[PDB]
Paper text:
Earlier we described circularly permuted GFP (cpGFP)-based Ca2+ sensors Case12 and Case16 with superior dynamic ranges of up to 12-fold and 16.5-fold increase in green fluorescence between Ca2+-free and Ca2+-saturated forms. The overall structure of these sensors is a monomer consisting of cpGFP “core” in its typical β-barrel shape inserted between an M13-peptide and CaM-domains. An alternative approach is to insert the single circularly permuted green fluorescent protein (cpGFP) between CaM and M13-peptide (fragment of myosin light-chain kinase).
Therefore the initial Ca2+-dependent fluorescent response of the sensor in 100–500 nM range of Ca2+ can be determined by the structural rearrangements in response to filling of the first two high-affinity Ca2+-binding pockets of the C-terminal part of CaM. In agreement with this data, the structure A of Case16 reveals that only the two C-terminal Ca2+-binding sites of CaM are occupied with Ca2+ whereas both of its N-terminal sites are Ca2+-free. The CaM domain is in its open extended conformation and the M13-peptide was bound only to the C-terminal lobe of CaM. Most likely, this particular CaM-M13 binding mode is mediated by the two complexed Ca2+ ions and an aromatic residue of the M13-peptide (Trp9) penetrating into a deep pocket of the C-terminal lobe of CaM. Case16 structure A demonstrates that Glu148 contacts the cpGFP chromophore directly, which is consistent with our previous conclusions based on site-specific mutagenesis.
Numbering used by the authors: 1 to 20, 23 to 106, 126 to 188, 192 to 325, 330 to 416
Amino acid sequence: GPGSSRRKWNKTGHAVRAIGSSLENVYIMADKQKNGIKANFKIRHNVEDGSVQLADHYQQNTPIGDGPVLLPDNHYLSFQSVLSKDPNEKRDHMVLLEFVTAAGSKGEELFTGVVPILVELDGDVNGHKFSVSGEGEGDATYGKLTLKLICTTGKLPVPWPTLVTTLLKCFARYPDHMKQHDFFKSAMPEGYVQERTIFFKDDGNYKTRAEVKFEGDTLVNRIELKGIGFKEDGNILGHKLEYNSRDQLTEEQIAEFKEAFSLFDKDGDGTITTKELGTVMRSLGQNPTEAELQDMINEVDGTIDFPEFLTMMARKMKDTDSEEEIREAFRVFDKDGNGYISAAELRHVMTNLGEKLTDEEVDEMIREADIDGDGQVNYEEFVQMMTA
Ligand SMILES: [Ca+2]
Ligand SMILES: [Ca+2]
Ligand SMILES: [Cl-]
């Protein structure tokens, strides 16, 4: 009866959960004509009511003039973003931290140390005008970008997370001779134009034009942004998006991981040996298994860069069981997204996972989870099954 049904729910739920966000990959494609690169990627913004706002990005980058900037093979850039606040700042603001790495030239030389950054954005969204003024530093050796961004015209009329991708791929860490493949640094100092359109599902879109380039020793990102088509009551103009995640890496955790990592970076490389990973990780008070560390390693390919290392760290600490993990699992089961799991949708998932169950076993599961007696499983009824 009730005992095996709950198990079925909890174990199926566990399996679906286990499929694991600050992290996101971008496939960079060479574009031969126009002498640049292009890309398409989706960002999934969490909404305060537990749903998700999709943002579809399309991007072209082209050099500012003029001469030699060689094109890379298609490759991946991997991004991890940390958003926080400054408790001393009274203005509407974002602290942003970003860590970026590639998986498989004089401009390169301009990135060997810590580079200052100016960011400026002029925006107009549904005729609401705004500017953002920003300042920071970038440290390509560590694939690291650090920004403090302020809204100068008062209260930002859209959410901060929707401007993150708009507000410097030149600070990405390119490994050991993928550097021959680094469009963003070799375009410097003259730099490159970076254009996007971002389509927010069931809402509006942005078009942005940015110039990234050196002005003296300062790396500048100057951006014009225009938005049209948004719902005044939507997730964007209505500010219905979560700024942060509970499970997220901390700015303080990161300073410590970096000191710990650089202790073993014997060459000034921004790299540690594969065989050092255990030591480093145990000094940061965690205790990974003999074969787990192996999995972290074999997923490298013999060295680990800082963003790579930070991705490993963010993977543990990822609360397995989060309000947000449970919401995503709910969506796997509620295929038509009407807010209820029907007997037919539960069968579907079971059958697709390879979990053999009779019709009667499936009705028992529904009956067990269904508090209100309407024959289907809503989100709060689901959470009670997912929870120990
Ligand atoms: Ca449904
Ligand atoms: Ca129900
Ligand atoms: Cl976005």
